[PDB]
């Protein structure tokens, strides 16, 4: 009918096999909280798994209100993992974040001056950056450049051991100039807007050895193409061979993310845990 029998979801942008021409003609309450919480659990769980998250500080720039972060804060606390959380955003945060000894809350706008200031403060504890700066409509290609620009500075000043930034290629038809962005894997996002190209650039550094990759307009086109496929044709299928309460692609995609998440509790199978996690996350966010 329009069902499918996949083997695994597309986890990274690189993994997209087809593509389609962006046709201009183009849910759940609290999705843009699910999209974020599911991506940060994956990322920080990935870290913890390669022992980088161990007793480090997670700095967040552009984190408001970041309700979801409370959950993340709690998931890890309960896991015994010791982490310092620092959230900085020009605006204020959801009160559920106040009073946490392990969570500091800065309310100011960042820039060179400041980044050099906190690095001094935080050193020598390793830093894990999570950038989600914003500039409603659509941000301008000029704002995307100005944003991705800044994010690269956070990388230089802070010199983070690992980072997670926003990555939505500028639209080819709205190209300006080229640019460089950290080397990293572009993590696709579940429960993300129907026609979003936005992904997550997860990257792990090696300190003395930095790496950037030049983004061009040729590239920008393969972005719009492959993403529009993922959105129009891929995330609309039903994984018939996915034994789970929900079979819509995303639920199948969110499954593969959480399976890689640790929980001290015990479960009979993984389906048992994923279903548990989901059940918890959707609970905290208040999604029926």
């Amino acid at each position: 009918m329009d069902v499918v029998s996949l083997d695994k979801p597309f986890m990274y942008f690189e993994e997209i096999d087809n593509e389609l021409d962006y046709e201009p003609e183009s849910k759940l309450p609290y999705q843009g909280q699910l999209k974020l919480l599911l991506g940060e659990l994956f990322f920080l769980s990935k870290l913890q798994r390669h022992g980088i998250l161990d007793g480090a500080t997670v700095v967040y720039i552009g984190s408001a209100p970041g309700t979801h972060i409370r959950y993340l804060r709690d998931h890890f606390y309960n896991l015994g993992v010791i982490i310092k959380w620092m959230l900085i955003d020009g605006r204020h945060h959801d009160p559920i974040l106040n009073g946490l000894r392990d969570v500091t809350l800065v309310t100011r706008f960042v820039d060179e001056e400041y980044l050099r200031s906190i690095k001094k403060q935080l050193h020598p504890s390793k830093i894990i950056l999570i950038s989600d700066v914003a500039s409603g409509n659509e941000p301008s290609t000029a704002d995307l450049l100005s944003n991705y620009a800044l994010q690269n500075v956070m990388i230089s000043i802070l010199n983070p051991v690992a980072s997670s930034l926003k990555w939505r290629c500028p639209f080819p038809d709205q190209w300006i100039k080229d640019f460089y962005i950290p080397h990293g894997n572009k993590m696709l996002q579940p429960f993300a807007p129907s026609y979003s190209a936005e992904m997550r650039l997860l990257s792990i550094y090696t300190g003395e050895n930095m790496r950037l990759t030049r983004v061009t307009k040729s590239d920008a086109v393969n972005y719009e193409k492959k993403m529009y496929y993922l959105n129009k044709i891929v995330r609309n299928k039903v994984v018939v061979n996915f034994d789970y309460p929900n079979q819509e692609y995303d639920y199948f995609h969110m499954y593969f993310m959480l399976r890689t998440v640790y929980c001290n509790k015990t479960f009979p199978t993984t389906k048992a845990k994923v279903l548990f996690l989901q059940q918890s996350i959707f609970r905290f966010l208040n999604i029926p």
């Binding site: 986890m11 690189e14 022992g51 007793g55 106040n98 009073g99 390793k126 051991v161 593969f256 640790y262």
Partner: protein, 445 residues
């Protein structure tokens, strides 16, 4: 409403508008603390001083004041930050002491020539009063908490060879942060000693408490519940010990670190005791054939002096041909990401590296210095160290390990002390030294 009182019935004063704002979110934890009988508590620290702390020069009034005194220093303390720090530590008592410390009151000789043989085969290199007053306290913990505490180190072999001297108990716990706190609150109320809980950065999930004079009392390593299972365990005096087979495998990966060699330099006999106690366990336990004759073991460990990656050949033992052993864990974690790898097997401290069998190739990280025989020639112990590592994985995933071990063991009998031509340099581990200090109300990480 009641938050108003909760906060006031806690600070021994009236909550300021500034304070009512911050603390407000701990209206439940502060209440649960107030409503907490701060007496039966005094009844338990005492019903311990006389059970594991007899030799203690202090009246039952100190081990009664110190208590109540802490439990109400919100009155003396007006600093918003020190409160949050005294509120999260008081809470560790109100909810775990019971389940943690409360419960607390309710052969090899025939192989000495063998460890003797081997240790020398490689011989080529170049603490408070409570320390003891405590080990007694912990022997109980191992029993009362089978699945929230596993043991190893010297003391483990002691439950094996009652001749293996122990002066410290090394353990793994799926809660060693809750654990270490309560015991530091114990060593306090009873002694009156201001212990310091410090966390070492270059060590995966590690916290240790020390005394006023900077002396090591007891440490601990933390592991996910996940890991707590795959860790091969052995049951003894009602306490699980990290199976001596695994412990021994991890000792070959030990001598690969230049230091340990230098340690065995100034006491080639030190490990005879522990090492034989172990070659004696495996020989029996898994009928290990011990004969100088046993080739095919030191696997082709071609080392690439540039990309810092020893290339180990395991094809003659496992389905996965090679196993690219990295020397820089920050790199491996990155390359692994590039592989679009999401489920690399991590066992934390136990292995000090993760394992990924991506396409018949096993990628891993060696946490010690690579010893050489010559210019780009991976020294024999290092070749065995690496090998030993790979085998730790098997034991955690219940796979083929038996024979390889044998081959590995025999390779170490009757050999020619190949000098230490050179070695690689450990990768630097990031982080800052974190710590909790009850006295000064200081928590930093």
């Amino acid at each position: 409403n009641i938050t108003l009182k909760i906060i006031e019935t806690y600070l021994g004063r009236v909550p300021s508008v500034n304070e009512y704002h911050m603390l407000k979110s701990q209206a439940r934890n502060i209440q649960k603390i107030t409503v907490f009988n701060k007496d039966i508590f005094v009844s338990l620290v005492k019903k311990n001083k006389k059970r594991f702390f007899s030799d203690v020069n202090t009246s039952a009034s100190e081990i009664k004041d110190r208590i109540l005194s802490y439990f109400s220093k919100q009155t003396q303390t007006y600093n918003i930050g020190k409160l949050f720090t005294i509120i999260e530590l008081q809470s560790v008592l109100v909810t775990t002491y019971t389940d943690i410390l409360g419960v607390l009151t309710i052969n090899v000789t025939s192989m000495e020539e063998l460890a003797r043989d081997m240790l020398n085969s490689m011989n080529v290199a170049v603490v408070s009063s409570l320390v003891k007053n405590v080990n007694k306290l912990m022997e109980e913990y191992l029993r009362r908490h089978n699945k929230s505490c596993i043991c190893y180190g010297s003391y483990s072999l002691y439950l094996i060879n009652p001749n293996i001297r122990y002066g410290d108990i090394d353990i793994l716990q799926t809660n060693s942060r809750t654990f270490l706190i309560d015991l530091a609150f114990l060593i306090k109320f009873i002694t009156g000693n201001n212990i310091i809980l410090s966390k070492i950065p270059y060590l995966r999930n590690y916290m240790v408490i020390k005394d006023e004079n900077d002396n090591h009392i007891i440490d601990s390593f933390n592991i996910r519940q996940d890991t707590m299972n795959v860790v091969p365990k052995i049951f003894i005096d009602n306490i699980y010990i990290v199976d001596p087979t695994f412990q021994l495998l991890n000792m070959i990966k030990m001598f690969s670190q230049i230091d340990r060699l230098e340690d065995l330099s100034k006491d080639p006999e030190k490990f005879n005791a522990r090492m034989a106690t172990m070659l004696e366990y495996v020989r029996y336990t898994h009928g290990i054939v011990f004969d100088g004759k046993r080739n095919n073991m030191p696997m082709k460990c071609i080392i690439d002096e540039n990309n810092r990656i020893v290339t180990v050949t395991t094809k003659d033992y496992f389905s996965f041909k090679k196993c690219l052993v990295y020397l820089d864990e920050n790199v491996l974690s990155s390359d692994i990401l590039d592989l679009n790898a999401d489920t690399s097997c991590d066992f934390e401290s136990v292995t000090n590296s993760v394992y990924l069998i991506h396409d018949n190739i096993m990628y891993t990280y060696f946490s010690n210095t690579i010893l050489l025989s010559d210019k780009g020639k991976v020294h024999e112990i290092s070749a065995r160290g690496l090998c030993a590592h790979i085998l730790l994985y098997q034991m955690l995933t219940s796979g083929e390990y038996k024979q390889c071990l044998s081959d590995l063991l025999n390779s170490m009998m009757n050999r020619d002390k190949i000098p230490i031509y050179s070695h690689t340099e450990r990768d630097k581990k990031p982080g800052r030294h974190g710590f909790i200090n009850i006295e000064k109300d200081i928590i930093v990480f």
